[PDB]
Amino acid sequence: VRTIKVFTTVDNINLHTQVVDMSMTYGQQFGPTYLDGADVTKIKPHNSHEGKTFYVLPNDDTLRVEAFEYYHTTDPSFLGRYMSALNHTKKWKYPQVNGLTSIKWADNNCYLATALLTLQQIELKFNPPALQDAYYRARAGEAANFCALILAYCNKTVGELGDVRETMSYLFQHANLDSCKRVLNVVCKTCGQQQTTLKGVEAVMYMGTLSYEQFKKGVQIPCTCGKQATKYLVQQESPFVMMSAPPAQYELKHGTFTCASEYTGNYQCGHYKHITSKETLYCIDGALLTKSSEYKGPITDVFYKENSYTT
Ligand SMILES: [Cl-]
Ligand SMILES: [Cl-]
Ligand SMILES: [Cl-]
Ligand SMILES: [Zn+2]
């Protein structure tokens, strides 16, 4: 008898009119249902709910198409993981630190803070509208949705230990890096030499050394024959490159890199900070900011600006 009008959605843009019985739960009428992140599946409608938007799971073909077009995923648990994260990230704080949106420390989110600070310093466009829209809001300071999306895309829950390199890998997978190209040459004294071409995400990430100059000069790797072959960078076309390695004491010089991630800890427990090279070296640690003329610390990732390099 008693009803209210509400709207359901999967993208918070296209709304679907619903009339709900106030004597049954949302779950009985829609399946799993969320109100700005809060799980209301076992709740009966409130008068204050009239006219509000609820997220639901894509349970008919219209919602399936809308969800895929917005998120570029068909993982069945995606929307519930995104809402579950959002219920936490909407209570985090996003101070502006040295002109960049950061995140006040909470819930082991230090890896997200330094990923978010890095994105704001490299040229990158996302493909899913969900990330496009949310990143735009994050840049303006309202990063809760963007953080909850990163958690959902990376299959990490709030509180879980994250790795920055992994996280950037997922984000780059959803970015337009089609123009990026890398050419490598690997030289073995017994085996000869062999050139490789990498594209897309693989053309901007390297795991083994932090130094972009070292990568151009050559780095030693196993060869199949048993000896030490040498790999060096012969050509690069991309707006940035990311150089990563297991954390090691490393010296960062002002004006020689864009930004970097520092990791202190061990494989199951640690803390990331972000170092950015501007008019001096700034260390952003969530809401905290310090500066110094030189830097040395356990660095794990270094980002460098690029455009075209040929050897
Ligand atoms: Cl929708
Ligand atoms: Cl109320
Ligand atoms: Cl974007
Ligand atoms: Zn060899």
PDB file of C-alpha atoms and ligand atoms in Angstrom:
ATOM      1  CA  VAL A   1       0.000   0.000   0.000  1.00  0.00           C
ATOM      2  CA  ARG A   2       2.727   2.472   1.127  1.00  0.00           C
ATOM      3  CA  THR A   3       5.332   3.196  -1.532  1.00  0.00           C
ATOM      4  CA  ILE A   4       8.008   5.736  -2.387  1.00  0.00           C
ATOM      5  CA  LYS A   5       9.625   6.532  -5.730  1.00  0.00           C
ATOM      6  CA  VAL A   6      13.396   5.947  -5.919  1.00  0.00           C
ATOM      7  CA  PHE A   7      15.871   5.639  -8.785  1.00  0.00           C
ATOM      8  CA  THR A   8      18.186   2.747  -9.391  1.00  0.00           C
ATOM      9  CA  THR A   9      21.444   2.988 -11.299  1.00  0.00           C
ATOM     10  CA  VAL A  10      24.742   1.318 -12.058  1.00  0.00           C
ATOM     11  CA  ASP A  11      26.669   4.438 -13.235  1.00  0.00           C
ATOM     12  CA  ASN A  12      25.028   7.238 -11.207  1.00  0.00           C
ATOM     13  CA  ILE A  13      24.108   8.978 -14.486  1.00  0.00           C
ATOM     14  CA  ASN A  14      21.362   6.894 -16.164  1.00  0.00           C
ATOM     15  CA  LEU A  15      18.535   6.597 -13.632  1.00  0.00           C
ATOM     16  CA  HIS A  16      15.779   4.021 -13.586  1.00  0.00           C
ATOM     17  CA  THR A  17      12.477   4.911 -11.954  1.00  0.00           C
ATOM     18  CA  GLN A  18      11.228   2.455  -9.336  1.00  0.00           C
ATOM     19  CA  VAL A  19       8.293   2.365  -6.972  1.00  0.00           C
ATOM     20  CA  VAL A  20       9.138   0.436  -3.830  1.00  0.00           C
ATOM     21  CA  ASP A  21       6.934  -1.092  -1.166  1.00  0.00           C
ATOM     22  CA  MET A  22       7.919   0.319   2.198  1.00  0.00           C
ATOM     23  CA  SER A  23       7.057  -3.001   3.892  1.00  0.00           C
ATOM     24  CA  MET A  24       9.772  -5.000   2.095  1.00  0.00           C
ATOM     25  CA  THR A  25      13.543  -4.655   2.155  1.00  0.00           C
ATOM     26  CA  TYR A  26      15.463  -3.220  -0.784  1.00  0.00           C
ATOM     27  CA  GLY A  27      17.043  -6.649  -1.117  1.00  0.00           C
ATOM     28  CA  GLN A  28      13.659  -8.319  -1.604  1.00  0.00           C
ATOM     29  CA  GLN A  29      12.826  -5.868  -4.383  1.00  0.00           C
ATOM     30  CA  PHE A  30      16.149  -5.127  -6.150  1.00  0.00           C
ATOM     31  CA  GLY A  31      18.754  -7.597  -4.930  1.00  0.00           C
ATOM     32  CA  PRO A  32      21.933  -6.144  -3.367  1.00  0.00           C
ATOM     33  CA  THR A  33      21.322  -2.398  -3.045  1.00  0.00           C
ATOM     34  CA  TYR A  34      23.571   0.446  -1.931  1.00  0.00           C
ATOM     35  CA  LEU A  35      23.023   4.072  -0.952  1.00  0.00           C
ATOM     36  CA  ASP A  36      26.187   6.103  -1.603  1.00  0.00           C
ATOM     37  CA  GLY A  37      28.273   3.073  -0.558  1.00  0.00           C
ATOM     38  CA  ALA A  38      26.137   1.939   2.380  1.00  0.00           C
ATOM     39  CA  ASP A  39      24.691  -1.544   1.950  1.00  0.00           C
ATOM     40  CA  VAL A  40      20.898  -1.147   2.379  1.00  0.00           C
ATOM     41  CA  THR A  41      19.972  -4.655   1.147  1.00  0.00           C
ATOM     42  CA  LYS A  42      18.471  -5.583   4.545  1.00  0.00           C
ATOM     43  CA  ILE A  43      16.885  -2.141   5.211  1.00  0.00           C
ATOM     44  CA  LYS A  44      13.206  -1.185   4.533  1.00  0.00           C
ATOM     45  CA  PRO A  45      12.577   2.133   2.750  1.00  0.00           C
ATOM     46  CA  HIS A  46      12.658   5.356   4.777  1.00  0.00           C
ATOM     47  CA  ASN A  47      10.610   8.443   3.874  1.00  0.00           C
ATOM     48  CA  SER A  48      13.864  10.398   3.440  1.00  0.00           C
ATOM     49  CA  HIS A  49      14.758   7.926   0.689  1.00  0.00           C
ATOM     50  CA  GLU A  50      12.146   9.233  -1.707  1.00  0.00           C
ATOM     51  CA  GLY A  51      13.716  10.577  -4.855  1.00  0.00           C
ATOM     52  CA  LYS A  52      17.200   9.267  -3.981  1.00  0.00           C
ATOM     53  CA  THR A  53      19.483   7.122  -6.197  1.00  0.00           C
ATOM     54  CA  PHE A  54      20.459   3.574  -5.201  1.00  0.00           C
ATOM     55  CA  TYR A  55      23.110   1.450  -6.828  1.00  0.00           C
ATOM     56  CA  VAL A  56      22.098  -2.077  -7.767  1.00  0.00           C
ATOM     57  CA  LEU A  57      23.849  -4.967  -9.550  1.00  0.00           C
ATOM     58  CA  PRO A  58      23.387  -5.323 -13.305  1.00  0.00           C
ATOM     59  CA  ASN A  59      20.581  -7.918 -13.323  1.00  0.00           C
ATOM     60  CA  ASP A  60      18.992  -7.121 -16.740  1.00  0.00           C
ATOM     61  CA  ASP A  61      20.474  -6.426 -20.150  1.00  0.00           C
ATOM     62  CA  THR A  62      20.073  -2.651 -20.031  1.00  0.00           C
ATOM     63  CA  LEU A  63      22.048  -2.413 -16.772  1.00  0.00           C
ATOM     64  CA  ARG A  64      24.680  -4.877 -18.069  1.00  0.00           C
ATOM     65  CA  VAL A  65      25.364  -2.663 -21.102  1.00  0.00           C
ATOM     66  CA  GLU A  66      25.333   0.548 -18.995  1.00  0.00           C
ATOM     67  CA  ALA A  67      27.742  -1.022 -16.447  1.00  0.00           C
ATOM     68  CA  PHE A  68      30.180  -2.329 -19.055  1.00  0.00           C
ATOM     69  CA  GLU A  69      30.140   0.941 -20.982  1.00  0.00           C
ATOM     70  CA  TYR A  70      30.924   2.932 -17.794  1.00  0.00           C
ATOM     71  CA  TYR A  71      33.437   0.609 -16.053  1.00  0.00           C
ATOM     72  CA  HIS A  72      34.908  -1.619 -18.857  1.00  0.00           C
ATOM     73  CA  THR A  73      34.502  -4.700 -16.627  1.00  0.00           C
ATOM     74  CA  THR A  74      32.100  -7.649 -16.396  1.00  0.00           C
ATOM     75  CA  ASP A  75      33.421  -8.930 -13.060  1.00  0.00           C
ATOM     76  CA  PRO A  76      30.211  -9.890 -11.192  1.00  0.00           C
ATOM     77  CA  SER A  77      31.566  -8.676  -7.829  1.00  0.00           C
ATOM     78  CA  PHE A  78      32.857  -5.324  -9.153  1.00  0.00           C
ATOM     79  CA  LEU A  79      29.996  -3.069  -8.074  1.00  0.00           C
ATOM     80  CA  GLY A  80      29.757  -4.557  -4.590  1.00  0.00           C
ATOM     81  CA  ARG A  81      33.539  -4.168  -4.152  1.00  0.00           C
ATOM     82  CA  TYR A  82      33.382  -0.554  -5.386  1.00  0.00           C
ATOM     83  CA  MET A  83      30.498   0.321  -3.033  1.00  0.00           C
ATOM     84  CA  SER A  84      32.197  -1.494  -0.122  1.00  0.00           C
ATOM     85  CA  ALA A  85      35.345   0.591  -0.652  1.00  0.00           C
ATOM     86  CA  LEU A  86      33.407   3.832  -1.209  1.00  0.00           C
ATOM     87  CA  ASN A  87      31.725   3.454   2.165  1.00  0.00           C
ATOM     88  CA  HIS A  88      35.225   3.920   3.666  1.00  0.00           C
ATOM     89  CA  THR A  89      36.886   6.273   1.200  1.00  0.00           C
ATOM     90  CA  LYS A  90      34.098   8.778   1.480  1.00  0.00           C
ATOM     91  CA  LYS A  91      35.253   9.312   5.088  1.00  0.00           C
ATOM     92  CA  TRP A  92      38.930   9.766   4.254  1.00  0.00           C
ATOM     93  CA  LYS A  93      40.394  13.277   3.981  1.00  0.00           C
ATOM     94  CA  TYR A  94      42.029  14.597   0.799  1.00  0.00           C
ATOM     95  CA  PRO A  95      44.184  17.612   1.716  1.00  0.00           C
ATOM     96  CA  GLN A  96      45.849  19.659  -0.965  1.00  0.00           C
ATOM     97  CA  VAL A  97      49.620  19.242  -0.412  1.00  0.00           C
ATOM     98  CA  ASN A  98      51.946  21.451  -2.468  1.00  0.00           C
ATOM     99  CA  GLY A  99      49.167  21.929  -4.995  1.00  0.00           C
ATOM    100  CA  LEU A 100      48.322  18.198  -5.361  1.00  0.00           C
ATOM    101  CA  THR A 101      45.449  16.162  -4.019  1.00  0.00           C
ATOM    102  CA  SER A 102      46.812  13.809  -1.366  1.00  0.00           C
ATOM    103  CA  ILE A 103      45.187  11.453   1.161  1.00  0.00           C
ATOM    104  CA  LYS A 104      45.463  11.687   4.959  1.00  0.00           C
ATOM    105  CA  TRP A 105      46.781   8.383   6.249  1.00  0.00           C
ATOM    106  CA  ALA A 106      44.109   5.778   7.119  1.00  0.00           C
ATOM    107  CA  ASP A 107      43.504   2.077   6.529  1.00  0.00           C
ATOM    108  CA  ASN A 108      46.980   1.349   5.058  1.00  0.00           C
ATOM    109  CA  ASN A 109      46.205   3.770   2.206  1.00  0.00           C
ATOM    110  CA  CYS A 110      49.767   5.086   1.818  1.00  0.00           C
ATOM    111  CA  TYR A 111      50.231   3.230  -1.488  1.00  0.00           C
ATOM    112  CA  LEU A 112      47.096   4.855  -2.855  1.00  0.00           C
ATOM    113  CA  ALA A 113      48.280   8.304  -1.796  1.00  0.00           C
ATOM    114  CA  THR A 114      51.559   8.006  -3.604  1.00  0.00           C
ATOM    115  CA  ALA A 115      49.848   6.502  -6.691  1.00  0.00           C
ATOM    116  CA  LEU A 116      47.358   9.416  -6.698  1.00  0.00           C
ATOM    117  CA  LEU A 117      50.128  11.985  -6.303  1.00  0.00           C
ATOM    118  CA  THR A 118      52.080  10.334  -9.152  1.00  0.00           C
ATOM    119  CA  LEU A 119      49.116  10.383 -11.561  1.00  0.00           C
ATOM    120  CA  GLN A 120      48.861  14.132 -11.082  1.00  0.00           C
ATOM    121  CA  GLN A 121      52.408  14.525 -12.355  1.00  0.00           C
ATOM    122  CA  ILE A 122      52.383  12.337 -15.492  1.00  0.00           C
ATOM    123  CA  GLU A 123      50.431  12.709 -18.716  1.00  0.00           C
ATOM    124  CA  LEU A 124      47.827   9.947 -18.817  1.00  0.00           C
ATOM    125  CA  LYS A 125      44.218   9.584 -20.028  1.00  0.00           C
ATOM    126  CA  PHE A 126      41.906   6.838 -18.806  1.00  0.00           C
ATOM    127  CA  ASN A 127      39.632   4.796 -21.096  1.00  0.00           C
ATOM    128  CA  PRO A 128      36.676   3.884 -18.768  1.00  0.00           C
ATOM    129  CA  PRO A 129      34.328   6.820 -18.279  1.00  0.00           C
ATOM    130  CA  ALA A 130      34.165   5.837 -14.609  1.00  0.00           C
ATOM    131  CA  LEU A 131      37.870   6.583 -14.175  1.00  0.00           C
ATOM    132  CA  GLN A 132      37.757   9.634 -16.434  1.00  0.00           C
ATOM    133  CA  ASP A 133      34.957  11.203 -14.370  1.00  0.00           C
ATOM    134  CA  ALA A 134      36.338  10.203 -10.991  1.00  0.00           C
ATOM    135  CA  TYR A 135      39.899  11.290 -11.768  1.00  0.00           C
ATOM    136  CA  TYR A 136      38.613  14.688 -12.767  1.00  0.00           C
ATOM    137  CA  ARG A 137      36.888  15.037  -9.393  1.00  0.00           C
ATOM    138  CA  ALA A 138      40.002  13.738  -7.590  1.00  0.00           C
ATOM    139  CA  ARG A 139      42.134  16.426  -9.213  1.00  0.00           C
ATOM    140  CA  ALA A 140      39.707  18.999  -7.888  1.00  0.00           C
ATOM    141  CA  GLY A 141      40.014  17.498  -4.402  1.00  0.00           C
ATOM    142  CA  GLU A 142      37.050  15.099  -4.156  1.00  0.00           C
ATOM    143  CA  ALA A 143      38.912  11.810  -4.603  1.00  0.00           C
ATOM    144  CA  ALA A 144      36.687   9.377  -2.694  1.00  0.00           C
ATOM    145  CA  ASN A 145      35.164   7.802  -5.799  1.00  0.00           C
ATOM    146  CA  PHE A 146      38.511   7.599  -7.611  1.00  0.00           C
ATOM    147  CA  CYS A 147      40.155   5.853  -4.616  1.00  0.00           C
ATOM    148  CA  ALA A 148      37.268   3.387  -4.292  1.00  0.00           C
ATOM    149  CA  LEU A 149      37.506   2.630  -8.024  1.00  0.00           C
ATOM    150  CA  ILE A 150      41.241   1.965  -7.778  1.00  0.00           C
ATOM    151  CA  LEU A 151      40.535  -0.463  -4.933  1.00  0.00           C
ATOM    152  CA  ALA A 152      37.839  -2.196  -7.024  1.00  0.00           C
ATOM    153  CA  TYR A 153      39.891  -2.393 -10.219  1.00  0.00           C
ATOM    154  CA  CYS A 154      42.917  -3.743  -8.307  1.00  0.00           C
ATOM    155  CA  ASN A 155      40.804  -6.237  -6.307  1.00  0.00           C
ATOM    156  CA  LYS A 156      42.105  -4.788  -3.034  1.00  0.00           C
ATOM    157  CA  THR A 157      39.879  -4.077  -0.028  1.00  0.00           C
ATOM    158  CA  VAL A 158      40.254  -1.110   2.300  1.00  0.00           C
ATOM    159  CA  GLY A 159      42.957  -1.978   4.831  1.00  0.00           C
ATOM    160  CA  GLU A 160      44.801  -4.468   2.629  1.00  0.00           C
ATOM    161  CA  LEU A 161      48.521  -3.953   1.949  1.00  0.00           C
ATOM    162  CA  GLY A 162      49.071  -2.690  -1.603  1.00  0.00           C
ATOM    163  CA  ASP A 163      52.132  -2.399  -3.898  1.00  0.00           C
ATOM    164  CA  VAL A 164      52.534   0.832  -5.927  1.00  0.00           C
ATOM    165  CA  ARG A 165      54.010  -0.853  -9.015  1.00  0.00           C
ATOM    166  CA  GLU A 166      51.082  -3.363  -9.181  1.00  0.00           C
ATOM    167  CA  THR A 167      48.607  -0.560  -8.673  1.00  0.00           C
ATOM    168  CA  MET A 168      50.096   1.574 -11.456  1.00  0.00           C
ATOM    169  CA  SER A 169      50.072  -1.517 -13.670  1.00  0.00           C
ATOM    170  CA  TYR A 170      46.276  -1.882 -13.271  1.00  0.00           C
ATOM    171  CA  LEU A 171      45.689   1.810 -13.868  1.00  0.00           C
ATOM    172  CA  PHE A 172      47.901   1.837 -17.004  1.00  0.00           C
ATOM    173  CA  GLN A 173      45.990  -1.156 -18.273  1.00  0.00           C
ATOM    174  CA  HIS A 174      42.906   1.123 -18.301  1.00  0.00           C
ATOM    175  CA  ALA A 175      44.705   4.102 -19.874  1.00  0.00           C
ATOM    176  CA  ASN A 176      45.324   4.963 -23.519  1.00  0.00           C
ATOM    177  CA  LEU A 177      49.003   4.075 -23.906  1.00  0.00           C
ATOM    178  CA  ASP A 178      48.580   2.739 -27.451  1.00  0.00           C
ATOM    179  CA  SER A 179      51.098   5.310 -28.834  1.00  0.00           C
ATOM    180  CA  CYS A 180      53.897   4.096 -26.503  1.00  0.00           C
ATOM    181  CA  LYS A 181      56.778   2.112 -27.966  1.00  0.00           C
ATOM    182  CA  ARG A 182      60.049   0.779 -26.588  1.00  0.00           C
ATOM    183  CA  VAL A 183      62.921  -0.964 -28.431  1.00  0.00           C
ATOM    184  CA  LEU A 184      65.433  -3.076 -26.494  1.00  0.00           C
ATOM    185  CA  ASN A 185      68.654  -4.797 -27.538  1.00  0.00           C
ATOM    186  CA  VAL A 186      69.951  -7.824 -25.559  1.00  0.00           C
ATOM    187  CA  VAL A 187      73.556  -8.893 -26.241  1.00  0.00           C
ATOM    188  CA  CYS A 188      75.076 -12.229 -25.147  1.00  0.00           C
ATOM    189  CA  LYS A 189      78.759 -12.897 -25.788  1.00  0.00           C
ATOM    190  CA  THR A 190      77.994 -16.577 -26.660  1.00  0.00           C
ATOM    191  CA  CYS A 191      74.452 -16.206 -27.907  1.00  0.00           C
ATOM    192  CA  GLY A 192      74.663 -13.127 -30.175  1.00  0.00           C
ATOM    193  CA  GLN A 193      72.342 -10.139 -29.938  1.00  0.00           C
ATOM    194  CA  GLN A 194      68.572  -9.839 -30.139  1.00  0.00           C
ATOM    195  CA  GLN A 195      66.272  -6.825 -30.435  1.00  0.00           C
ATOM    196  CA  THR A 196      62.747  -6.651 -28.952  1.00  0.00           C
ATOM    197  CA  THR A 197      59.892  -4.198 -29.402  1.00  0.00           C
ATOM    198  CA  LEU A 198      57.445  -3.511 -26.563  1.00  0.00           C
ATOM    199  CA  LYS A 199      54.082  -1.663 -26.810  1.00  0.00           C
ATOM    200  CA  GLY A 200      51.528  -0.044 -24.569  1.00  0.00           C
ATOM    201  CA  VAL A 201      51.918  -0.662 -20.831  1.00  0.00           C
ATOM    202  CA  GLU A 202      55.014  -2.840 -21.351  1.00  0.00           C
ATOM    203  CA  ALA A 203      56.736   0.071 -23.116  1.00  0.00           C
ATOM    204  CA  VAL A 204      56.557   2.401 -20.056  1.00  0.00           C
ATOM    205  CA  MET A 205      57.327   0.005 -17.149  1.00  0.00           C
ATOM    206  CA  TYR A 206      60.649  -1.674 -16.327  1.00  0.00           C
ATOM    207  CA  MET A 207      61.474  -3.842 -13.299  1.00  0.00           C
ATOM    208  CA  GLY A 208      65.118  -4.228 -12.444  1.00  0.00           C
ATOM    209  CA  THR A 209      66.715  -0.827 -12.076  1.00  0.00           C
ATOM    210  CA  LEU A 210      65.634   2.611 -10.846  1.00  0.00           C
ATOM    211  CA  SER A 211      68.004   4.563 -13.100  1.00  0.00           C
ATOM    212  CA  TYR A 212      66.833   5.589 -16.561  1.00  0.00           C
ATOM    213  CA  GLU A 213      70.472   6.373 -17.525  1.00  0.00           C
ATOM    214  CA  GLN A 214      71.620   2.930 -16.353  1.00  0.00           C
ATOM    215  CA  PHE A 215      68.844   1.406 -18.548  1.00  0.00           C
ATOM    216  CA  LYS A 216      70.211   3.307 -21.548  1.00  0.00           C
ATOM    217  CA  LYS A 217      73.778   2.180 -20.770  1.00  0.00           C
ATOM    218  CA  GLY A 218      72.859  -1.457 -20.202  1.00  0.00           C
ATOM    219  CA  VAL A 219      71.808  -3.812 -17.378  1.00  0.00           C
ATOM    220  CA  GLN A 220      72.919  -7.376 -16.756  1.00  0.00           C
ATOM    221  CA  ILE A 221      70.367 -10.186 -17.007  1.00  0.00           C
ATOM    222  CA  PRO A 222      70.459 -13.991 -17.251  1.00  0.00           C
ATOM    223  CA  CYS A 223      70.869 -15.559 -20.667  1.00  0.00           C
ATOM    224  CA  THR A 224      69.465 -18.979 -21.535  1.00  0.00           C
ATOM    225  CA  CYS A 225      73.026 -20.210 -22.241  1.00  0.00           C
ATOM    226  CA  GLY A 226      74.060 -19.640 -18.604  1.00  0.00           C
ATOM    227  CA  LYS A 227      76.099 -16.418 -19.080  1.00  0.00           C
ATOM    228  CA  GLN A 228      75.455 -12.710 -18.339  1.00  0.00           C
ATOM    229  CA  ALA A 229      73.777 -11.008 -21.267  1.00  0.00           C
ATOM    230  CA  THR A 230      73.274  -7.234 -21.389  1.00  0.00           C
ATOM    231  CA  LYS A 231      70.015  -5.394 -22.118  1.00  0.00           C
ATOM    232  CA  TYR A 232      69.946  -1.730 -23.081  1.00  0.00           C
ATOM    233  CA  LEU A 233      67.375   0.790 -24.309  1.00  0.00           C
ATOM    234  CA  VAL A 234      67.701   1.646 -27.978  1.00  0.00           C
ATOM    235  CA  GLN A 235      64.504   3.663 -28.543  1.00  0.00           C
ATOM    236  CA  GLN A 236      61.661   5.175 -26.463  1.00  0.00           C
ATOM    237  CA  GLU A 237      58.434   6.951 -27.486  1.00  0.00           C
ATOM    238  CA  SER A 238      56.170   7.790 -24.461  1.00  0.00           C
ATOM    239  CA  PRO A 239      55.300  10.828 -22.285  1.00  0.00           C
ATOM    240  CA  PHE A 240      56.849   9.213 -19.190  1.00  0.00           C
ATOM    241  CA  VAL A 241      58.607   6.105 -18.092  1.00  0.00           C
ATOM    242  CA  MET A 242      58.427   4.234 -14.777  1.00  0.00           C
ATOM    243  CA  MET A 243      61.525   2.478 -13.495  1.00  0.00           C
ATOM    244  CA  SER A 244      61.024   0.012 -10.588  1.00  0.00           C
ATOM    245  CA  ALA A 245      63.163  -2.283  -8.415  1.00  0.00           C
ATOM    246  CA  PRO A 246      63.034  -4.079  -5.007  1.00  0.00           C
ATOM    247  CA  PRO A 247      63.513  -1.305  -2.399  1.00  0.00           C
ATOM    248  CA  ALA A 248      67.130  -0.254  -2.021  1.00  0.00           C
ATOM    249  CA  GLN A 249      69.063   2.679  -0.615  1.00  0.00           C
ATOM    250  CA  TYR A 250      69.092   5.155  -3.478  1.00  0.00           C
ATOM    251  CA  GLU A 251      69.994   8.798  -4.017  1.00  0.00           C
ATOM    252  CA  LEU A 252      67.517  11.157  -5.715  1.00  0.00           C
ATOM    253  CA  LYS A 253      68.934  14.341  -7.311  1.00  0.00           C
ATOM    254  CA  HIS A 254      66.871  17.453  -7.774  1.00  0.00           C
ATOM    255  CA  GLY A 255      65.863  17.998 -11.444  1.00  0.00           C
ATOM    256  CA  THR A 256      66.805  14.483 -12.663  1.00  0.00           C
ATOM    257  CA  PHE A 257      63.430  12.737 -12.233  1.00  0.00           C
ATOM    258  CA  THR A 258      59.785  13.636 -11.857  1.00  0.00           C
ATOM    259  CA  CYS A 259      58.683  11.793  -8.745  1.00  0.00           C
ATOM    260  CA  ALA A 260      59.364   8.589  -6.861  1.00  0.00           C
ATOM    261  CA  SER A 261      58.010   6.166  -4.250  1.00  0.00           C
ATOM    262  CA  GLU A 262      59.947   5.245  -1.097  1.00  0.00           C
ATOM    263  CA  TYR A 263      59.084   2.071   0.841  1.00  0.00           C
ATOM    264  CA  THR A 264      60.216   1.332   4.406  1.00  0.00           C
ATOM    265  CA  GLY A 265      59.362  -2.053   5.827  1.00  0.00           C
ATOM    266  CA  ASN A 266      59.327  -5.696   4.796  1.00  0.00           C
ATOM    267  CA  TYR A 267      57.340  -7.879   2.505  1.00  0.00           C
ATOM    268  CA  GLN A 268      54.195  -8.060   4.671  1.00  0.00           C
ATOM    269  CA  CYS A 269      54.207  -4.668   6.375  1.00  0.00           C
ATOM    270  CA  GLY A 270      55.574  -1.235   5.515  1.00  0.00           C
ATOM    271  CA  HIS A 271      55.070   2.403   4.659  1.00  0.00           C
ATOM    272  CA  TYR A 272      55.250   4.294   1.366  1.00  0.00           C
ATOM    273  CA  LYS A 273      56.101   7.976   0.973  1.00  0.00           C
ATOM    274  CA  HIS A 274      56.153  10.102  -2.168  1.00  0.00           C
ATOM    275  CA  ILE A 275      59.110  12.265  -3.300  1.00  0.00           C
ATOM    276  CA  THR A 276      58.524  14.975  -5.915  1.00  0.00           C
ATOM    277  CA  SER A 277      61.237  17.115  -7.611  1.00  0.00           C
ATOM    278  CA  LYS A 278      60.002  20.720  -8.032  1.00  0.00           C
ATOM    279  CA  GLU A 279      61.853  23.885  -6.979  1.00  0.00           C
ATOM    280  CA  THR A 280      63.382  21.600  -4.346  1.00  0.00           C
ATOM    281  CA  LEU A 281      62.761  17.983  -3.229  1.00  0.00           C
ATOM    282  CA  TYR A 282      59.439  17.615  -1.396  1.00  0.00           C
ATOM    283  CA  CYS A 283      58.490  14.501   0.567  1.00  0.00           C
ATOM    284  CA  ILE A 284      54.710  14.051   0.763  1.00  0.00           C
ATOM    285  CA  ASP A 285      53.603  11.488   3.329  1.00  0.00           C
ATOM    286  CA  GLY A 286      49.806  11.600   3.183  1.00  0.00           C
ATOM    287  CA  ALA A 287      48.922  14.963   4.830  1.00  0.00           C
ATOM    288  CA  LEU A 288      52.580  15.551   5.896  1.00  0.00           C
ATOM    289  CA  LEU A 289      55.081  17.614   3.888  1.00  0.00           C
ATOM    290  CA  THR A 290      58.826  18.102   4.400  1.00  0.00           C
ATOM    291  CA  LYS A 291      61.520  19.401   2.089  1.00  0.00           C
ATOM    292  CA  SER A 292      65.249  18.841   1.569  1.00  0.00           C
ATOM    293  CA  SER A 293      67.972  19.673  -0.939  1.00  0.00           C
ATOM    294  CA  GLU A 294      69.207  16.070  -1.269  1.00  0.00           C
ATOM    295  CA  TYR A 295      67.476  12.727  -0.730  1.00  0.00           C
ATOM    296  CA  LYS A 296      68.539   9.178   0.075  1.00  0.00           C
ATOM    297  CA  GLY A 297      66.177   6.406   1.087  1.00  0.00           C
ATOM    298  CA  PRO A 298      64.766   3.005   0.136  1.00  0.00           C
ATOM    299  CA  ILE A 299      63.289   3.888  -3.285  1.00  0.00           C
ATOM    300  CA  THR A 300      61.112   1.351  -5.232  1.00  0.00           C
ATOM    301  CA  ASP A 301      59.808   3.383  -8.216  1.00  0.00           C
ATOM    302  CA  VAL A 302      61.051   6.436 -10.111  1.00  0.00           C
ATOM    303  CA  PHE A 303      59.141   8.280 -12.814  1.00  0.00           C
ATOM    304  CA  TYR A 304      60.872  10.248 -15.537  1.00  0.00           C
ATOM    305  CA  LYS A 305      59.530  12.585 -18.100  1.00  0.00           C
ATOM    306  CA  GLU A 306      60.016  11.525 -21.746  1.00  0.00           C
ATOM    307  CA  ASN A 307      58.922  12.235 -25.274  1.00  0.00           C
ATOM    308  CA  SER A 308      61.244  10.630 -27.826  1.00  0.00           C
ATOM    309  CA  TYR A 309      64.659   9.032 -27.303  1.00  0.00           C
ATOM    310  CA  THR A 310      66.827   7.235 -29.862  1.00  0.00           C
ATOM    311  CA  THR A 311      70.273   5.887 -29.051  1.00  0.00           C
TER     312      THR A 311
HETATM  313 CL    CL B   1      22.815   3.206 -14.496  1.00  0.00          CL
HETATM  314 CL    CL B   2      16.330   8.998   8.327  1.00  0.00          CL
HETATM  315 CL    CL B   3      41.253  10.901 -17.755  1.00  0.00          CL
HETATM  316 ZN    ZN B   4      73.806 -16.272 -23.583  1.00  0.00          ZN
END
